Ligand binder design. Structure first.
Ligand SMILES: C[C@H](C[C@@H](C[C@H](C[C@@H](C[C@@H](CCN1CCCC1=O)N1CCCC1=O)N1CCCC1=O)N1CCCC1=O)N1CCCC1=O)N1CCCC1=O
Ligand SMILES: COc1cc(CCNC(=O)c2nc(-c3ccccc3F)[nH]c(=O)c2O)ccn1
Ligand SMILES: [Mn+2]
Ligand SMILES: [Mn+2]
Length: 185
């Protein structure tokens, strides 16, 4: 119990802000990549936020529309990706995406930003390069930006995500945690 703390204000906020299972998946995703949520608390909240947005995103639309890639361990996620590619014929993406759209026949990369959605997508579009994987960026301010202006979901489903994102921002600010969270990206 030396360099590893017993608790943090951000960690306690993450646990009361997000559903317990979302917190567990974020802990597993971080520990799989050698990161401890008890110290890097800003990344802990961001992974939780990205997880919840991904699950809300898949909750929009029909029952069998989306195959959820995020939230699984790396090996299982790449296994499902291989099955989707070897079933639909879609090219294997270089980087692990977040979802697959059975309706649109494309993988989706979900992004949640604390800057303008313009820089983030411009980053993610240049990282994945492949103009076949769909990109959908959400901001804590309420904007969004998707590939070919195709926002996939209904307006109501996307507005729910933007509303939740702004609520997380307000809850952090009332705890004086937002500025360090914003400056961490
Ligand atoms: C399948 C299972 C877990 C799922 C996680 C995901 C969570 C989903 C639950 C829904 C219902 N709602 C809505 C009301 C509250 C709630 O809970 N949502 C969406 C909103 C927040 C939330 O919680 N879903 C979707 C299918 C059913 C389910 O539970 N996951 C985890 C990653 C991959 C995946 O599909 N799995 C699979 C094996 C391990 C495990 O845990
Ligand atoms: C540093 O890299 C990782 C990766 C993992 C597991 C897989 N995570 C992603 O693939 C994935 N990650 C992120 C994100 C990463 C760090 C901070 C805030 C984020 F929002 N955004 C995505 O959009 C996104 O898809 C856990 C911790 N750190
Ligand atoms: Mn991901
Ligand atoms: Mn993502």
């Amino acid at each position: 119990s030396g360099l590893v703390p017993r608790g943090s204000h951000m960690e306690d906020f993450v646990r009361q802000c997000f559903n317990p299972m979302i917190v567990e998946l974020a802990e597993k995703a971080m520990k799989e990549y050698g990161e401890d949520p008890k110290i890097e608390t800003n990344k802990f909240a961001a992974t939780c936020t990205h997880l919840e947005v991904c699950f809300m995103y898949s909750d929009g639309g029909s029952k069998h529309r989306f195959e959820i890639i995020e939230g699984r361990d790396r090996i299982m996620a790449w296994t499902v990706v291989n099955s989707i590619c070897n079933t639909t014929g879609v090219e294997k993406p270089k980087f692990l995406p977040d979802l697959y759209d059975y309706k649109e026949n494309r993988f989706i990369e979900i992004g949640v930003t604390r800057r303008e959605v313009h820089i983030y997508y411009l980053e993610k579009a240049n990282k994945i390069k492949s103009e076949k994987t769909h990109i959908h960026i959400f901001s804590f301010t309420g904007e969004e930006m998707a590939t070919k202006a195709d926002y996939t979901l209904d307006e109501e489903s996307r507005a729910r995500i933007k509303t939740r994102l702004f609520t997380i921002r307000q809850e952090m600010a009332s705890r004086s945690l937002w500025d360090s969270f914003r400056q961490s990206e």
